[PDB]
Amino acid sequence: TQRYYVERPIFSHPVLQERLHTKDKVPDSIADKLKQAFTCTPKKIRNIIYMFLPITKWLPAYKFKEYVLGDLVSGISTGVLQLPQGLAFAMLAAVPPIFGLYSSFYPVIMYCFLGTSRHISIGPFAVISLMIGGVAVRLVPDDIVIPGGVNATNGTEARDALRVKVAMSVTLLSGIIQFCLGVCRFGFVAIYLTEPLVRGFTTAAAVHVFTSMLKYLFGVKTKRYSGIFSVVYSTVAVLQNVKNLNVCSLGVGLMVFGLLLGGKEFNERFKEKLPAPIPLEFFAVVMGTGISAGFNLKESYNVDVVGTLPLGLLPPANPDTSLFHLVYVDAIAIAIVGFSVTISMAKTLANKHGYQVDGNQELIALGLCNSIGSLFQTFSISCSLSRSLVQEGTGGKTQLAGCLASLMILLVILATGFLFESLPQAVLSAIVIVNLKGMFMQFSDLPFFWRTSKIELTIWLTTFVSSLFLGLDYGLITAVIIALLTVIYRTQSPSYKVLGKLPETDVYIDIDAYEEVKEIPGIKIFQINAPIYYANSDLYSNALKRKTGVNPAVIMGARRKAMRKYAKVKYPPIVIKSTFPEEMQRFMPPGDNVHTVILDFTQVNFIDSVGVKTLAGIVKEYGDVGIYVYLAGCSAQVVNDLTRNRFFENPALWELLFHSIHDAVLGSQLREALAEQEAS
Amino acid sequence: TQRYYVERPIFSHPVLQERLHTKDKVPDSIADKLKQAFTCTPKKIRNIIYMFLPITKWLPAYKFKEYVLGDLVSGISTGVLQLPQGLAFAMLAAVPPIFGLYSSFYPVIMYCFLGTSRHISIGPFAVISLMIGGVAVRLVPDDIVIPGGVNATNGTEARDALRVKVAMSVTLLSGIIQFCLGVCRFGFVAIYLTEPLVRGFTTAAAVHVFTSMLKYLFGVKTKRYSGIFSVVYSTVAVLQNVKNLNVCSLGVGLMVFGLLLGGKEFNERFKEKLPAPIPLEFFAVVMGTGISAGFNLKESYNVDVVGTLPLGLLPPANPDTSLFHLVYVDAIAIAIVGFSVTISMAKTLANKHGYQVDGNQELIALGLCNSIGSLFQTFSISCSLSRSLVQEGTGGKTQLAGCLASLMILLVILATGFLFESLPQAVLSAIVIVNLKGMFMQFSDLPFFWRTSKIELTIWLTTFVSSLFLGLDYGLITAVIIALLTVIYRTQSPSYKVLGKLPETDVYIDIDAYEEVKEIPGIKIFQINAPIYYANSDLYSNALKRKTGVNPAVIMGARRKAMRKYAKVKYPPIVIKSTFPEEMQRFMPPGDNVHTVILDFTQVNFIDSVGVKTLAGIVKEYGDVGIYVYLAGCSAQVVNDLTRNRFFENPALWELLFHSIHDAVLGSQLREALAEQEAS
Numbered sequence A, B: 001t002q003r004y005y006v007e008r009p010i011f012s013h014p015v016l017q018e019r020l021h022t023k024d025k026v027p028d029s030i031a032d033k034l035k036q037a038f039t040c041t042p043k044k045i046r047n048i049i050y051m052f053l054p055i056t057k058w059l060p061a062y063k064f065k066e067y068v069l070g071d072l073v074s075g076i077s078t079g080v081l082q083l084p085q086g087l088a089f090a091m092l093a094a095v096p097p098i099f100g101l102y103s104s105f106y107p108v109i110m111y112c113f114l115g116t117s118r119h120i121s122i123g124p125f126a127v128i129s130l131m132i133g134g135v136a137v138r139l140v141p142d143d144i145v146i147p148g149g150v151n152a153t154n155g156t157e158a159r160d161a162l163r164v165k166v167a168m169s170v171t172l173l174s175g176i177i178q179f180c181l182g183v184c185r186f187g188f189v190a191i192y193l194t195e196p197l198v199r200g201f202t203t204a205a206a207v208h209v210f211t212s213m214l215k216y217l218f219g220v221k222t223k224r225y226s227g228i229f230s231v232v233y234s235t236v237a238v239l240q241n242v243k244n245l246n247v248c249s250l251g252v253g254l255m256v257f258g259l260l261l262g263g264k265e266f267n268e269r270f271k272e273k274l275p276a277p278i279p280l281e282f283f284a285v286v287m288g289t290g291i292s293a294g295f296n297l298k299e300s301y302n303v304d305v306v307g308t309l310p311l312g313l314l315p316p317a318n319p320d321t322s323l324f325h326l327v328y329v330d331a332i333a334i335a336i337v338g339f340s341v342t343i344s345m346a347k348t349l350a351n352k353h354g355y356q357v358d359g360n361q362e363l364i365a366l367g368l369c370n371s372i373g374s375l376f377q378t379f380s381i382s383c384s385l386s387r388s389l390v391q392e393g394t395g396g397k398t399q400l401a402g403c404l405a406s407l408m409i410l411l412v413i414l415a416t417g418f419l420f421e422s423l424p425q426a427v428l429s430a431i432v433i434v435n436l437k438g439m440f441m442q443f444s445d446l447p448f449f450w451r452t453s454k455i456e457l458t459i460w461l462t463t464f465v466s467s468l469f470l471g472l473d474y475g476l477i478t479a480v481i482i483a484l485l486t487v488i489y490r491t492q493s494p495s496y497k498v499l500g501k502l503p504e505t506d507v508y509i510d511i512d513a514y515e516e517v518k519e520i521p522g523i524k525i526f527q528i529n530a531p532i533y534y535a536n537s538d539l540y541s542n543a544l545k546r547k548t549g550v551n552p553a554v555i556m557g558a559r560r561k562a563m564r565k566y567a568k569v570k571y572p573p574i575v576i577k578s579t580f581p582e583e584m585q586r587f588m589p590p591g592d593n594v595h596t597v598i599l600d601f602t603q604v605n606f607i608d609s610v611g612v613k614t615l616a617g618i619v620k621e622y623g624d625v626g627i628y629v630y631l632a633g634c635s636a637q638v639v640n641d642l643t644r645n646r647f648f649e650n651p652a653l654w655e656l657l658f659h660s661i662h663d664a665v666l667g668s669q670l671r672e673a674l675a676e677q678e679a680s
């Protein structure tokens, strides 16, 4: 083993700069940069095609023998849950359920082509459907007058058609906004969604989904709520109207709930003994529809059912732009939340499988899916969190599982929709609530983040609370801003350390940590692991004066107290010799006799005008009491900040900068040695 | 001159920790901390008295011979401007002007006792008066029905009294809120008001004051505006109604404006030849009142005048709490803005004279002033920015200048108010607009901050725009949040450097800077001057792979390409030996042959779970291609972050941590030397 041997002079800033000569920057012209960016080599255009059409990349590279079984199983398990989820979220959107079935088919196919993530389940989302239903009922209220040429016994088909038109218009506008954001490179903001923020946001979204499904489980009538505290208002309304519950609907829902939970526990416990998990949502749907049809619960017990499901696909229809001015604000929120849910969950799965998802391409895919689907009577889509978990955890590898689920949905649409006409809505709510269990399991992060990092636990809890009580649109931006402000908190509460020297080395460590580190007599070394910016400068100065025990104000006060008791352009030097008489020095209270204060700037990232002013004040105040202040380890960037401000207006301050702590200590000791040599 | 000599072994983390033994933390119990905090020594209670009653400190220490002349001159110059400003801002508040005169007397006296700043002019502020007038006219509209027992020719005395009652109620509530905030240590938030933010905010406030004075200068009638874009609405309304201007009012205002500007230029240019600046506002008031009375402009030309000013002070009257529920929201905003203007300007002056102001005591003083003054028919106060500049720049030393100005205001109130009854409001507006020149001079900061720091120039401009177009309440919080986010931007755009070694030393400097620094063959040293938190980790990884030119993905791709072309708990090792055949190695494109990558962590302040995951991924990916990754200069705090996360789940990673760059380089070279020794 070799050894660490260094033999060189003390490197103050002028001494080190005497060795260093400026290098010539290589020419980097912007025009040539653009010209070389517009070369258009075939590899570049192939990469562009892959970036905009990801299916052109992962589909030719499809490992059939390794992927087909997992994709098939995941697709079946995803579709059996996608059908009832589609119907339920169509009910949430104040549109007929067949439109939810449509929204479960086209967008998934288009996202298989345009999407980067290979584990998320594209489809209707409860919160997005709630926003769509809110805007649709605002524009088309229940008490609207429609001269449709019908008798007094109106079947509300015209109202449903008008609400469908409103939903398509808002979906098209949200898709256009999302596509424009994706083109404008907005997806970079996805870097601000940290893992605790994403997980708290998704858990709050799951709680929102659970709240939105309560009225259909109980069979009660409830006002639509959307906005701040919408979850609280909805829960309060449900618990208020629970006295008018439908006992038959609640019984069927709870029965499906219990069997679904039992089956899920059976699947999880016997996972190793089962070739593929049993698709339980399909069994629940079939069993609930059979019980509802056999006992005729629709009118004998007034149990709400799905209703008629027309067969066949609809031709493309141009949405009316004339409603844009009435929905644009809403179309903005749906544009954000729909992205926020999609890019969060994708990340949650991407980090689970060691790949990365392009936020810009996610925005482009979402926008194109929404805008094109609005032509096919599709309302706004997102990522279904619980269904994404089901798809990922069932062995899903690519998005071909989404295509298989869409094919099952298309089978329902084209041929077998009429079988699900008598299916109660309580069964759908029970299915959704049961499948929210995997998302509710994310509450185990609280002990985890408690043990790992309490700041990120705070981020988790703040995101959860803000996205729960406020909306997922205002709550998300609140959480993002607070998570960013956690960095400000970190800089505002740094580790102020007083350093001591490990003997016979150049290693300087916190004096109160190891106890072989010994403080150098007459020298104080103070270290902050933070920048010295404006929100930090005063705290840094106070901590420097407190921890080191060298307060210039206290020193001046003691000198004046002894003065009271004993009685019975061309610049001046920075450090003023203490002209205190020895007879009056007999009145000094005993002290550490510190002649130099070393400020460790190795971990100081930057310093602004306020920090520079504080530093200059510190230097001047310590020089007024005859104490030298040295800066050790100032980076070239921090030196540039000190130079851009007028810190080095006096060139003498240049000799206060040293390369390292050991350089500063040696320079101070040499300064003292020369001073005592010249003294006598 | 001595030399830097170091001779020691290579300090990897285990090697250095073998020398270091844990120290015993001194016992610091919270109960004993509270017990020693409740000692109540006479010095402690004296300090408490000084902190809560600052006049008990600076008044006994009043240097009479050095301060009296400056205080007298500053007080006279402050009062001559305080009178018309008080009348004008009373007009802004929809209250009779005598109430502005009252608001110019009691709060200044109380702030002389309770205030920490010794240069700001306490009094009515245009924006606070605008908020008070807005709430007063909202609660008491111009078309209100008052059964006051009067004829059809109502003189609007009852409406004025009701508006005064509303103003007192909102003032009392705002004062209570401010006092409660000051007690609760809210003033700490004053640390978040950096100098560019403060100066931009104050310049925007000056523009607000200029906008609010236009209608009285032109003599036009304008709707009251308060809220977002209130300045734009007010300016648009004034320029719309300017066709109905009062030519006499505009002429008198512009004449006073021109003489005031000429006199101010005369005072500034001949400052050295004048013992004291001429008080020009008093001359303007006297001259305008004399012209208005002599030519009888009140009804001959329908020129708006100040109106009657009753003489004598009013007895204390209890404000009606019954209006609190109607004004509380407004009382919150006035509580914030009034503090925000006061603590900003104070800081602006404090930094100018080398002292500090306690934000908590500023809040307490403002709250007590407002709450007690509301008993004396005083509406909410703040710091007058232009008058504060006048007081500071005229030689003001203590707050006794404020007391002299208050004594002049009291002289006007008690005996000579009736002389100012015929004074036109155009003269008051002209005086205010002329005196806003010193505040408008702050626009010179734009070239200054352009040269010093463009980030803080951005802070200046953002604060100005936000506080201008939005209110001073929403604009201020917007500016504070954006100024805080500038730190996030700084961390998100750090200096990614590739380091090279200065020969015969241990100094490692950016390779592209000095050109005597030479890169060590086979070793890459990468440095970031930022933390590696979540919003930074992916950028840091990309920059590491790009700047160093060592991309593990590209290396694996090239190895597989050569494979194609040539054909025609117990853990595994971190770094996998590259089992590439020499015959296939003949297919390697030439490369740098880098065996070790050194990551400089000296300037990395902290690392969270996301950063730790990125770092572990970097280590694993580089070890998969047979490249070692070393961490150099990891602080004890960063080591604690890596340990709290499961980074050191494999103990072998402990040997990847070195004390410094030179230690890591020597360790890598020794590792290679031992490898070649054992090879053959």
Ligand SMILES: CC(C)CCC[C@@H](C)[C@H]1CC[C@H]2[C@@H]3CC=C4C[C@@H](O)CC[C@]4(C)[C@H]3CC[C@]12C
Pocket (backbone or CB within 6 Å): A228, A470, A474, A477, A478, A481, A482, A485, B481
């Ligand atoms: C200061 C940092 C730490 C947090 C900032 C949070 C901000 C962005 C949050 C806090 C609460 C939020 C408000 C809560 C409610 C509403 C009402 C709604 O109809 C429009 C949005 C609006 C007005 C929100 C705007 C954004 C908001 C002001």
Ligand SMILES: CC(C)CCC[C@@H](C)[C@H]1CC[C@H]2[C@@H]3CC=C4C[C@@H](O)CC[C@]4(C)[C@H]3CC[C@]12C
Pocket (backbone or CB within 6 Å): B228, B474, B477, B478, B481, B482, B485
């Ligand atoms: C960089 C940005 C995101 C930092 C945070 C700025 C936040 C705190 C600002 C920016 C825009 C602001 C909003 C702008 C306008 C209004 C309408 C007004 O009637 C109530 C306040 C409210 C709702 C503001 C609340 C605060 C607000 C949301």
Ligand SMILES: CCCCCCCCCCCCCC
Pocket (backbone or CB within 6 Å): A454, A457, A458, A461, A462, A465
């Ligand atoms: C043990 C001292 C640190 C404790 C940190 C706990 C963080 C809790 C954050 C709660 C945030 C709630 C937002 C409404």
Ligand SMILES: CCCCCCCCCCCCCC
Pocket (backbone or CB within 6 Å): A453, A454, A455, A458, A482, A485, A486, A489
């Ligand atoms: C080990 C973590 C020590 C700190 C625990 C408490 C963290 C509190 C973070 C508060 C951040 C507030 C940002 C607005």
Ligand SMILES: CCCCCCCCCCCCCC
Pocket (backbone or CB within 6 Å): B454, B457, B458, B461, B462, B465
């Ligand atoms: C020369 C490249 C840096 C230029 C920085 C200029 C900053 C201007 C900020 C403007 C903010 C306006 C907010 C509406």
Ligand SMILES: CCCCCCCCCCCCCC
Pocket (backbone or CB within 6 Å): B453, B454, B455, B458, B482, B485, B486, B489
């Ligand atoms: C010399 C300064 C280099 C950077 C100039 C441009 C600074 C732009 C700051 C933008 C901050 C945005 C925070 C929301």
Ligand SMILES: CCCCCCCCCCCC
Pocket (backbone or CB within 6 Å): A176, A177, A180, A181, A321, A324
């Ligand atoms: C950047 C998001 C908005 C893109 C512009 C959309 C404008 C709507 C299209 C015109 C409708 C009349």
Ligand SMILES: CCCCCCCCCCCC
Pocket (backbone or CB within 6 Å): A184, A185, A186, A188
């Ligand atoms: C509203 C549009 C915002 C666009 C923001 C683009 C930011 C791109 C930064 C790229 C950094 C690598």
Ligand SMILES: CCCCCCCCCCCC
Pocket (backbone or CB within 6 Å): A316, A317, A318, A372, A375
């Ligand atoms: C990806 C396929 C897009 C096809 C869009 C066709 C739109 C036709 C609209 C006809 C309106 C009458």
Ligand SMILES: CCCCCCCCCCCC
Pocket (backbone or CB within 6 Å): A177, A324, A325, A328, A332
């Ligand atoms: C987010 C940018 C605005 C989104 C597009 C709004 C289009 C409004 C059209 C209004 C027509 C009167």
Ligand SMILES: CCCCCCCCCCCC
Pocket (backbone or CB within 6 Å): A176, A179, A318, A319, A321, A367, A368, A371, A372
């Ligand atoms: C992002 C491109 C979306 C294209 C979908 C159709 C846009 C136009 C709608 C019909 C206008 C008449």
Ligand SMILES: CCCCCCCCCCCC
Pocket (backbone or CB within 6 Å): B176, B177, B180, B181, B321, B324
């Ligand atoms: C913290 C600021 C609010 C302090 C509480 C004020 C409550 C008003 C007093 C009671 C009025 C009826």
Ligand SMILES: CCCCCCCCCCCC
Pocket (backbone or CB within 6 Å): B184, B185, B186, B188
């Ligand atoms: C609304 C009340 C907020 C109180 C915040 C007090 C913060 C004090 C921090 C003290 C750090 C030295």
Ligand SMILES: CCCCCCCCCCCC
Pocket (backbone or CB within 6 Å): B316, B317, B318, B372, B375
């Ligand atoms: C600092 C002096 C405060 C005096 C407050 C007296 C309040 C008297 C109110 C009488 C109401 C009738």
Ligand SMILES: CCCCCCCCCCCC
Pocket (backbone or CB within 6 Å): B177, B324, B325, B328, B332
């Ligand atoms: C900032 C905390 C609230 C300020 C005090 C509000 C008092 C409201 C009283 C309402 C009475 C009905």
Ligand SMILES: CCCCCCCCCCCC
Pocket (backbone or CB within 6 Å): B176, B179, B318, B319, B321, B367, B368, B371, B372
């Ligand atoms: C902060 C203390 C202010 C005291 C001023 C009077 C508060 C009570 C107002 C009258 C209530 C009847």
